[PDB]
Structure 1
Amino acid sequence: LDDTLFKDEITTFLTENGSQSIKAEDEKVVMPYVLRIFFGRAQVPPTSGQKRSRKIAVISVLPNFKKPYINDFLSLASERLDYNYFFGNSHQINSSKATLKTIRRMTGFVNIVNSTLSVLRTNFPLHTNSVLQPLIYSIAMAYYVLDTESTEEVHLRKMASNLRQQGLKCLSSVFEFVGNTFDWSTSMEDIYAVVVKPRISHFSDENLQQPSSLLRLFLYWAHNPSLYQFLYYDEFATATALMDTISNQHVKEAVIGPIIEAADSIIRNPVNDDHYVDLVTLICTSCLKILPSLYVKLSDSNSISTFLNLLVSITEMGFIQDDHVRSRLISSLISILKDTQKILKIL
């Protein structure tokens, strides 16, 4: 609790295998007190260099703790967040809960989760009740406030927007670190319906400039076979939205390159289900349609190579059997001419 001795005490008292460290028997009783104390320090506003370091110190002792205790700390952050009503009902937000105060509480929670993810990374313990379902609820209200709120409450609108940006970033992080390890089938429908579904309609015009957290999210699913069922929902709505970004006239190279890499993985990652066949047919035709206009935009040799790598992927899988696929694969190829061995092999 003492401010001057706080930093030295953490390194001494809480270091794993420390001589002064808590004995294994005494952890169960002492630990809740430790978590509450460290939780108290975590709300210190970072308005100075010392204060920023203190917020880094409190998050940095998390790896020392055992995983059950880490989950306890994440729980304490989310206890204030009232979310059980949201998931209890059919995912409808209460008007009373929608206030600047509640937005302020969630912004703190996501920041702690973002900080914890950076420290633990793959070792981060992911649980439905403690972190994921409060996290999804936060992105839900950010959507709820922004559409419902009037332009007059600029401060609330700005505050909600920050929660959306952090929440989407917080998702894209947790998918990356622990996506493969954790099994998401139970919460899978909830994540799409609450996060991806509302923004699918305008996903195309939104992400032209550079990759965004929601876009980085879609790419990860495209890369990982297990999470393709995300791409299957709503007649492959997310799959189309990615190509709608590509189909736009003004999409920049930073956004182009990743998606073709993602699309190439899907072609090179066979999956045993009907939805996969309709997807790849959708993926190939859309990426094949707009390809020549993308090449002129491309200004990097590597960006050219990945474009070729997708073409050779098409030929190997046998889509070139189709007359429309073949004739247009040539059209994109001649645009490349208008790596060399890869081209010659394709010809």
Structure 2
Amino acid sequence: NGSQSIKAEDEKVVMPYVLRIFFGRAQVPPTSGQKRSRKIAVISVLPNFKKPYINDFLSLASERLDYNYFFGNSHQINSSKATLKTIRRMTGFVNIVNSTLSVLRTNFPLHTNSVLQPLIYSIAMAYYVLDTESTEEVHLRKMASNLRQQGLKCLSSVFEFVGNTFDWSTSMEDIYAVVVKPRISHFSDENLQQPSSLLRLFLYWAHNPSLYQFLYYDEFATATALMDTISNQHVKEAVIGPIIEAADSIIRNPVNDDHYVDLVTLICTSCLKILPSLYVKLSDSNSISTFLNLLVSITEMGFIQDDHVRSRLISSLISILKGKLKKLQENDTQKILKILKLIVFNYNCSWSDIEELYTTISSLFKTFDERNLRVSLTELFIELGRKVPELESISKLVADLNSYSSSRMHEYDFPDFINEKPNLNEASKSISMLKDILLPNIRIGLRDSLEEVVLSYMVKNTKYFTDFEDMAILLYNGDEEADRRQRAIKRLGEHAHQLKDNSISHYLIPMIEHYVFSDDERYRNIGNETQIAIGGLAQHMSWNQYKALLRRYISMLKTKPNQMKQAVQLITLRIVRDGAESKLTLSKFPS
């Protein structure tokens, strides 16, 4: 008969709204008691009478789900629903602790709340009943103790009711009457917030606009309290950033920066949070990261600091200038952030950024020589913008070489901090050399020569565009250096980049021989570069299977010579992974 009544519900829509409201009115007239319970509360209730009431709430749920647009709603059905919900609350909170009929009437009450939320799920902007405050005060006096009750990952009876009441136009009258956002914000600022906290945050972010478009001054102060909740909930959207739904945070922070500027410490906290929005997770997308940096700039245009947020915005621009993502949109937002950071370093940054980012002109090569002849003492964002131009951004090749040489000149004129800046230059040149670049690899080689300012002739002859006598002199220089972990790793990386699967050129056997000779000359340095030799042999072993295995086989055979010389010298090690790699070679032998 459940399947039969489900068929009756699936065919219970064929009659008009008059007959649907008449059948709903007959369903309401079972145990309404509007003479007894339309004033305040009910007169009496029973277990089987609540079972008629639980069945009435279930029939209301089935009728609303069947006719989930119109539902034939009536104030008699509303009064019967309020009488049933109040009788469920009264019986559950007035019965003794025996829990059988109490849990029956509690699962009657949760299902009746689900059927009540179904009415607003079906007929939301259709009725908008003007006597809402009766049921609103009834449900408030029932669920006053539901302060932090709806704070969970699945608690969505009163949380969904609050979201429905907040996502309307004029049904927020019961919200702005006394309180909805107070208890919602209490459970939102609860510290054990699960991932419905983002749902409540998006609901309040969408519901601040109705409280702002409302002409009532009470709703204006409630919108002020929603901005105050956005300022007092400065840990929830931080700690709940476990998914890629950071567009809600970027949509609230832009709304907050466009709406309310209430404290300089609040603007500094917003700028530091949007700095953590780019220094917290690397999976933030382009529009979200651009709007987050623009919201940090919008808080900085109002109430920024002069030293602390100055350095924070300078670090933000020093990351965003190395990024420059999304076809110069992030570069334009980074130029705006550097012009809003309000320092002397930021002033030189905005000058040397606007003088180069003038919409694809020769002003980039003009401004590189301009700041070279007029070298600025900030130099951090200058080295960022001149190392993005030294990377695989095609123009400013000689200007990139002059920028690296001028950074070396400043690092020699310092004579400590600018040597740690040269450490960052070397840690950038390492990832530049281990890459598929052509102009930026030559620029990193020029930076290696400027850091080297026999060895200088070796570097300039490795970057000589000749490659036959040049590679012969490189092999002879490796022989002279044989007769350095990261340094020889960088040299062998540049050599492997110049002979990296370029099988349209000859002497690849001597090129791999020079790679293995530099690897042997690094592996002779056992006290330092044994780890680097192990890493280079490991990367060559990964390349021995990664889609190409002709010259990598001879690289494996000639990197075995370091092991042969080490075993002849030993005449303790790690035999285990060596034997397992021997088993892997035996498996590659059965290919």
Give the TM-score normalised by the residue count of structure 2: 0.24
Please list the CA deviations of residues 323-344 of structure 1 after superposition, one character each: whole Å capped at 9, or x if unmatched. 88656544665687x9996788
The 3-state SS of whatever aligns with 2:192 is coil
Q: Would you say the 8 A contact 2:257–2:295 is kept in 1?
A: no
Query: Which stretch has the larger CA shift, 165-174 or 141-150?
Result: 141-150
CA distance in 1, matches of 2:18, 2:98: 21
Q: Would you say the 8 A contact 1:121–1:177 is kept in 2?
A: no
Cα 1:141–1:96, aligned 2, differ >3 Å: closer, same or farther? farther
Cα 1:327–1:59, aligned 2, differ >3 Å: closer, same or farther? farther
Please list the CA deviations of residues 19-71 of structure 1 after superposition, one character each: whole Å capped at 9, or x if unmatched. 99999999999946885499779999999999999999999999999999999
The Cα shift of 1:199 comes to 1.8
CA distance in 2, matches of 1:220, 1:311: 19
CA distance in 2, matches of 1:331, 1:99: 61
The Cα shift of 1:203 comes to 3.8
Cα 1:63–1:189, aligned 2, differ >3 Å: closer, same or farther? farther
Q: Would you say the 8 A contact 2:193–2:236 is kept in 1?
A: yes
The Cα shift of 1:140 comes to 18
The Cα shift of 1:188 comes to 3.0
Cα 1:284–1:110, aligned 2, differ >3 Å: closer, same or farther? farther
CA distance in 2, matches of 1:214, 1:109: 32
The 3-state SS of whatever aligns with 1:292 is coil
Q: Would you say the 8 A contact 1:168–1:214 is kept in 2?
A: no
The Cα shift of 1:112 comes to 31
Query: Which stretch has the larger CA shift, 267-276 or 123-132?
Result: 123-132
Q: Share of identical aligned residues, percent?
A: 100
Please list the CA deviations of residues 283-329 of structure 1 after superposition, one character each: whole Å capped at 9, or x if unmatched. 77545468438833665456972564444652796655988865654
Q: Would you say the 8 A contact 2:58–2:115 is kept in 1?
A: yes
The Cα shift of 1:216 comes to 3.9
CA distance in 1, matches of 2:215, 2:129: 27
Compute the RMSD of aligned alpha carbons: 14.0
Q: Would you say the 8 A contact 1:209–1:252 is kept in 2?
A: yes
The 3-state SS of whatever aligns with 1:268 is helix
CA distance in 2, matches of 1:305, 1:208: 27
The Cα shift of 1:205 comes to 3.9
CA distance in 1, matches of 2:37, 2:174: 37
Cα 1:306–1:290, aligned 2, differ >3 Å: closer, same or farther? closer
The 3-state SS of whatever aligns with 1:200 is helix
Cα 1:296–1:165, aligned 2, differ >3 Å: closer, same or farther? same
Work out which of the residue numbers 29, 35, 45 in structure 1 matches 2:13. Answer: 29
Q: Would you say the 8 A contact 1:267–1:313 is kept in 2?
A: no
Unaligned runs of 5+ in 2: 321-330, 340-591
Q: Would you say the 8 A contact 1:81–1:134 is kept in 2?
A: yes
Q: Would you say the 8 A contact 1:172–1:217 is kept in 2?
A: no
Kindly name which structure, 1 or 2, has the bigger radius of gyration based on alpha carbons: 2
Residue 284 of structure 2 corresponds to residue 291 of structure 1: no
The 3-state SS of whatever aligns with 1:98 is helix
Cα 1:217–1:140, aligned 2, differ >3 Å: closer, same or farther? farther
CA distance in 1, matches of 2:241, 2:36: 36
Q: Would you say the 8 A contact 1:59–1:119 is kept in 2?
A: no
Cα 1:77–1:44, aligned 2, differ >3 Å: closer, same or farther? same
Q: Would you say the 8 A contact 2:65–2:118 is kept in 1?
A: yes
CA distance in 2, matches of 1:22, 1:151: 30
Please list the CA deviations of residues 250-295 of structure 1 after superposition, one character each: whole Å capped at 9, or x if unmatched. 9687875699999999999999999745499957754546843883
Query: Which stretch has the larger CA shift, 241-250 or 300-309?
Result: 241-250
CA distance in 2, matches of 1:276, 1:120: 48
The Cα shift of 1:218 comes to 4.4
Answer 1 or 2: higher relative contact order, Cα 8 Å, separation at least 6. Answer: 1
Q: Greater helix percent: which structure?
A: 1
Cα 1:121–1:228, aligned 2, differ >3 Å: closer, same or farther? farther
CA distance in 1, matches of 2:214, 2:97: 24
CA distance in 2, matches of 1:287, 1:117: 55
Cα 1:208–1:56, aligned 2, differ >3 Å: closer, same or farther? same
Residue 120 of structure 2 corresponds to residue 136 of structure 1: yes
The 3-state SS of whatever aligns with 2:286 is helix
Q: Would you say the 8 A contact 2:151–2:194 is kept in 1?
A: no
Query: Which stretch has the larger CA shift, 280-289 or 51-60?
Result: 51-60
CA distance in 2, matches of 1:117, 1:298: 53
CA distance in 2, matches of 1:51, 1:132: 22
Q: Would you say the 8 A contact 1:126–1:178 is kept in 2?
A: no
The 3-state SS of whatever aligns with 1:96 is helix
The Cα shift of 1:152 comes to 26
Alignment of 1:97-246 (within 5 A): 102=86, 186-192=170-176, 196-200=180-184, 202-206=186-190, 210-212=194-196, 215-216=199-200, 218-219=202-203, 221-222=205-206, 225-228=209-212
The Cα shift of 1:139 comes to 17
The Cα shift of 1:197 comes to 3.5
CA distance in 1, matches of 2:96, 2:66: 17
Query: Which stretch has the larger CA shift, 71-80 or 191-200?
Result: 71-80
Cα 1:140–1:246, aligned 2, differ >3 Å: closer, same or farther? same
Cα 1:306–1:167, aligned 2, differ >3 Å: closer, same or farther? same
Cα 1:331–1:25, aligned 2, differ >3 Å: closer, same or farther? closer
The Cα shift of 1:212 comes to 2.1
CA distance in 1, matches of 2:316, 2:270: 13
Q: Would you say the 8 A contact 2:202–2:248 is kept in 1?
A: no
Q: Would you say the 8 A contact 1:139–1:163 is kept in 2?
A: no
The Cα shift of 1:191 comes to 1.4
Please list the CA deviations of residues 155-181 of structure 1 after superposition, one character each: whole Å capped at 9, or x if unmatched. 999999999999999999999999999
The Cα shift of 1:206 comes to 3.3
Match of 2:332 in 1: 339
CA distance in 2, matches of 1:167, 1:32: 41
CA distance in 2, matches of 1:235, 1:152: 17
CA distance in 1, matches of 2:72, 2:29: 34
Q: Would you say the 8 A contact 2:42–2:86 is kept in 1?
A: no
- Report how many residues are paired: 329
The 3-state SS of whatever aligns with 1:172 is coil
Give the TM-score normalised by the residue count of structure 1: 0.34
The Cα shift of 1:79 comes to 13
Query: Which stretch has the larger CA shift, 266-275 or 142-151?
Result: 142-151
CA distance in 2, matches of 1:308, 1:73: 46
Q: Would you say the 8 A contact 1:291–1:332 is kept in 2?
A: yes
